[PDB]
Every structure is written in C-alpha cells, then in structure tokens.
C-alpha cells in the first residue's frame, strides 16, 4: 500500500465519520472549553427535573437514578444504529459474510461506545443531547447504591483516553480498527477481516505520524488502550448483570434493550 492509497482511505473514513455521528469531537471540545449558546447544566435532582421539561428527552414514560440509567440505555441503542451505519463505509466491510458482519458489530459496539463517549466527556461532566446539555460528573458519581459506581468508571476511562489528545480524523480510523477485530468469537472466515484491519492499522499508523509528529510512539500507546478497553467492557456487563437481579420494565421494551 503506497502512501497515496492510505491517505485516501483516511479521508474516506473521516468524511463518513462526520456524516454518521451527530456530535463530533471538535464541536464537543469547543462547547466544553467555552469557545462557542451555553448548554443547560444538570448538577442535582431539581435541575434534571427542569431539563426534562425543557430539553424534552425522548426516553421518558419512576425513581431518579433509574431514569438516569435508562436514558443512557436509550442513547446507547441510538449509537448502535449509528456505528452500524458507519461500518458500511469501511472499504471491504459490506463484502463480508453476513454472519461475520453481525458478529463484528455485536462484539465491537460496547468498546466503540466507550471510546466515543470520551469525546463528549471531561474531568467534570458530560455533554448530552447533541451538545445542548451538560450533566455534571459530581452528580452522576453521587447517585445511590449501584447506580453511582456504574457511572464513574466511564469518566475515569475518558480522562485517561483524552490525554492522548486525538481528533476526529484519528478516531475515524481507530474506530474502524476496533470493528474489524478478527478474534471475535464465532467468526467463520477470519482472513479477510484481518486483511482489512492490517489495512486500517497501516492507515492509522501514518495518520498519527503526520497529524502528531511530536508525539513519540503514539500509535503504540493508543493500541495499548484497546487493551484497557477490553477490561472496562467486561467490568461493564458484570455490572449490568448485577443491576438486573436487584433493580427493574415493559415486555416489549425488554426486547429492544436485550443485550
């Protein structure tokens, strides 16, 4: 692969990335820093009870920490259809065996949600509703019994991840790399998936050297994050499993949020 072909693959994903996802990282960083119609801030129970009436949330039908929990699930399901659509533009993806496509997404969406969620997060809280809102980390971390400790590990990850200082052109490729993992359980034909990931890895390597020439071994250091990424996704589901056996939904709803 000559440099000309990789740079082309980079723009192809960067362009598709911009179209697929509602709030890019460049906009979210301008909002958080304060360089841009301020977001409505959620810092306690009373302000959330206001933000729902104001910034009318679509997941509203209930106890406070549960409602926060379920609004996240609503946003996750949405992001899953967003990532699914982005995958279709990864050169090669739509030519995979259809079962391999379903498998790659089934297993990759949590690591990619966790990743892109770092784009909307800083030390102190997280952007919501396409940047219209801001929910403080102090508030999320303070929620009761299980719900408090379910929220904080996200902020903890994102603070470490954001130290890498990636932008949207870096992330468009890094995301494509996650999807095309050849070690997902039960793939039928691994070779062409590794073939594509070897191509994206090549595109990721070059992008980083061009876009961060002063950041020694940034490529290696981001690949070690995918190590870290495997751990929080496991933690996550073993924390989901625990919520269910204690806390609470409508049978039709349960099918949507299944898995």
Helix (H, G, I), strand (E, B) or coil at 205: helix
Residue 114 lies near ligand A1IRA (rule: CB under 6 A): yes
Binding mask 126-165 for ligand A1IRA (x = CB under 6 A): x-x------x----x----------x--x-----------
Q: Please, what is the minimum distance in Å from the beta carbon of residue 66 to its own copies?
A: 14
Q: Please, what is the minimum distance in Å from the beta carbon of residue 107 to its own copies?
A: 11
- Binding annotation for rosiglitazone: 73-76, 110, 236, 257
User: Which of 58, 118, 111 minimizes the C-alpha distance to 83?
Assistant: 111
- In the chain, the largest separation of any two C-alpha atoms, in whole Å, equals 58
Whichever of 27 and 141 has its CB closer to its own copies, that residue is: 27
Residue 110: name its binding partner from its own copies, ligand A1IRA, none (Cβ under 5 to 8 Å by kind).
ligand A1IRA
Phi, psi (rounded to 5 degrees) for 254: -55, -35
Residue at shortest CB range from ligand A1IRA: 71
Residue 55 lies near its own copies (rule: CB under 8 A): no
Which residues, in sequence order, are CB contacts of 23 under 8 Å at separation 6+? 119, 120, 127, 130, 131
CB 39 within 8 A of CB 127: yes
CB 103 within 8 A of CB 29: no
CB 123 within 8 A of CB 137: yes
Q: Which of 10, 96, 166, 233 binds its own copies (CB under 8 A)?
A: 96
Q: Please, what is the minimum distance in Å from the beta carbon of residue 48 to its own copies?
A: 17
Whichever of 122 and 197 has its CB closer to ligand A1IRA, that residue is: 122
């Amino acid at each position: 692969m000559e440099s000309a072909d990789l740079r082309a693959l980079a723009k192809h994903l960067y362009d598709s990335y911009i179209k697929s996802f509602p709030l890019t990282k460049a906009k979210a960083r301008a909002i958080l820093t304060g360089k841009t119609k301020s977001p409505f801030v959620i810092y306690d129970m009373n302000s959330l009870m206001m933000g729902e009436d104001k910034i009318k949330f679509k997941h509203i039908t209930k106890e406070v920490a549960i409602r926060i929990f379920q609004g996240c699930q609503f946003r996750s399901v949405e992001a899953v259809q967003e990532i699914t659509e982005y995958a279709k533009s990864i050169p090669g993806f739509v030519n995979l065996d259809l079962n391999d496509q379903v498998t790659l997404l089934k297993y990759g969406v949590h690591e990619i949600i966790y990743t892109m969620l770092a784009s909307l997060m800083n030390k102190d809280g997280v952007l919501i509703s396409e940047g219209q809102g801001f929910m403080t980390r102090e508030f999320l971390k303070s929620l009761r019994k299980p719900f408090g400790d379910f929220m904080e590990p996200k902020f903890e990850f994102a603070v470490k991840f954001n130290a890498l200082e990636l932008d949207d052109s870096d992330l468009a490729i890094f995301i494509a790399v996650i999807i095309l993992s050849g070690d997902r359980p039960g793939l039928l034909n691994v070779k062409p998936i590794e073939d594509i990931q070897d191509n994206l890895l090549q595109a990721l390597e070059l992008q980083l050297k061009l876009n961060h020439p002063e950041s020694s071994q940034l490529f290696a250091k981001l690949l070690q994050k995918m190590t870290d990424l495997r751990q929080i996704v496991t933690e996550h589901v073993q924390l989901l499993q625990v919520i269910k056996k204690t806390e609470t939904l409508h049978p039709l709803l349960q099918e949507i949020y299944k898995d």
